[PDB]
Amino acid sequence: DWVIPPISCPENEKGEFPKNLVQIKSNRDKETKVFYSITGQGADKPPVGVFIIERETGWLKVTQPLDREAIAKYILYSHAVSSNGEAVEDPMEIVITVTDQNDN
Incomplete structure (x- = not known):
């Protein structure tokens, strides 16, 4: 279920x-195919141009990796829309924590 x-x-x-990182999960995805949208530091706010999401599949990809030395947890905001034409967005806050790279 989409709840995390x-x-x-x-x-x-x-x-x-x-490169892609992780898939996104909303909630309204229980009544109609919902598409995603993102906004906040890392996308439109400084650092602007870092994370990007596929409003269709909801795949969370980024142009720049994260850095524990700089930030241990990034925060972004997202909006939801119905692939049918009806808006179903809501002030959703996505919390992204950093994790040790595959190197360990």
Whole structure:
């Protein structure tokens, strides 16, 4: 079921950017295919241009990895819409915690 406010994002990820990190999960996805949207520091606010999400699949991808040395937990806001044409967004706060890279 789509119910998990907290999320995890690796740091110092190396490979091919932009790169995907984790899928998103809302809630209204129990009545109609809901699409996503993102806004807040990391997307539109400084640092602007870091995280990006697919309003269709809800895949959370980023152009820049995270850094525990800088921030241990990032926070973003998102909106929801019905792939049918009806808006179903709501002030949703997504919490993204940082986790040790695959290196350990």
